[PDB]
Paper text:
AIP56 is a short-trip single-chain AB toxin18,19 secreted by the type II secretion system of Phdp20.
The final crystallographic model of AIP56 does not include residues 290-295 (ND1), 362-385 (ND2), 422-429 (ND3) and 454–455 (ND4), which are poorly defined in the electron density maps. The three-dimensional structure of AIP56 shows a three-domain organization: (i) a N-terminal NleC-like catalytic domain (N1-F255) with a conserved zinc-binding motif (H165ExxH); (ii) a middle domain (G256-E307), with a disulfide bond (C262 and C298) flanking the 35 amino acid long linker peptide (S263 to E297), packed against the catalytic domain; and (iii) a C-terminal domain (P308-N497) previously shown to be involved in receptor binding. The active-site zinc ion of AIP56 is coordinated by H165 and H169 from helix α6 and by D176 located at the loop between helices α6 and α7. In two of the AIP56 monomers of the asymmetric unit, Y207 from the loop between helices α7 and α8 is the fourth zinc ligand, similar to what is observed in NleC24. These two cysteines flank the partially structured linker peptide that comprises helix η5 and strand β4 plus a connecting 15 residue-long unstructured loop (P270-A285) that contains an aspartate-rich patch at its tip (D274HDDD278). Although this domain shows some flexibility with respect to the catalytic and middle domains, it establishes a series of contacts with helix α2 of the catalytic domain that prevent large structural movements.
Residue numbers in the entry: 1 to 289, 296 to 361, 386 to 421, 430 to 453, 456 to 504
The structure:
Amino acid sequence: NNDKPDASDDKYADYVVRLGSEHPLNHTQIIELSSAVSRAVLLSYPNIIDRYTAAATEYTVIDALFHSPTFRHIVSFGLHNQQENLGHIRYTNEYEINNNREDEFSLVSEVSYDDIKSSNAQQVPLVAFYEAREDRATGTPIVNMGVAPSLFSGRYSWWQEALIHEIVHHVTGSSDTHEENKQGPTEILAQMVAAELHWAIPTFKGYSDPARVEAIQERDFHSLLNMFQRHGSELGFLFTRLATIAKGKKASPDFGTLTSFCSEGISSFPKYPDHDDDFNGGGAFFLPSVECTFDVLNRIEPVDDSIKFEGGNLLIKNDFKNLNLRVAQLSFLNAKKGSGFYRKNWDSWKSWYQAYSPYGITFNDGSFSIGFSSRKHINDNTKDDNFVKLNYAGQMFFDKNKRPVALVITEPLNAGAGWSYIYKDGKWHYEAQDDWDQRLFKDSTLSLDPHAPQFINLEHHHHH
Ligand code: NI
Ligand SMILES: [Zn+2]
């Protein structure tokens, strides 16, 4: 069974989960996607109204990525089925004059606070249209939405579901339905993710139930008011930022004029999603002893132009920790800074295996090897690599696509006899019997992680 149902058919939700499950996202892919989302949200700061909505957007998407199997099926579907990539989507908080109040207001900059304060959800002068749209100039996917509500307002988890909804429209291409008592495939998909993440949301007859529409007007009206409450001392600076973004313009990328978030503290601010004991990653606006920060680029700072995911972005500092590549980064950056790479005559890294100024070795198929030392390449910021806890001259192999393959270690005896670890799913795996090349890479030269980061040793590889 595989008829592609129409984008508006409820059975299209089943079509997305059934095809997205065919290609499960490995650990390397979840780590790539989480780092791509963090970057997309950061690059969206000029269009987000405040640090609160910016943090709510990022942690909502990362929480779903980590703890919602259906969200992973949805995101996987898009990659394999010519829809949008989760990291490609940018976010806007574009407000506009309510159509029923446009006889008095001709600019967003005219509406005062008391015009919103002394109003109701149906006649509020400012409205934001939740929409999965495209920037007509560049063709980039955008998600438009209103500001995030107060954490314990009782509305926040529905705002969360509402954001996942608009993303579902991009990564699955599904549509919504007008029909009575029908939720539609996008709303079905979003509600599954919300159910898995324990997000409490209200239920209605269908997507176009008038009761549903009135409740959304209420949620978005209260979120705008909760947001104003958040900025009681900088209302002038907040309204100017709102008006700038409202006219499709880029406002401060670092929220410069807004400072009142520090006084409010972490306590009432969105929390980073829960993660494994072996996870390196944290919040954006507050840093351990907690103390708020004004540097925003530093967490998504790319390490080197040569270390990137294929067809993706350059690996950020956390990417190396989460993928067990800190020893690999140190030894690669070492040869690439020292004596460079020297081309020896062996067909591949496998053929080589079978028969100060740190150097590197390039093979005939493009693959390469790097030097490993217990003294210089076993450190405190290299210690956490899982091959270290598991169980010294080594030569770590990288395939023709510059991806990590294996790490072969030896001690000063039995010159020979040593230890071997293999790279699979963002981790190193101890393979005791040293014949693993015939029993693992049987008739192949490539790494066991086809999603692992690329360590482009020589600049010309960027062309092939
Ligand atoms: Ni794209
Ligand atoms: Zn929709």
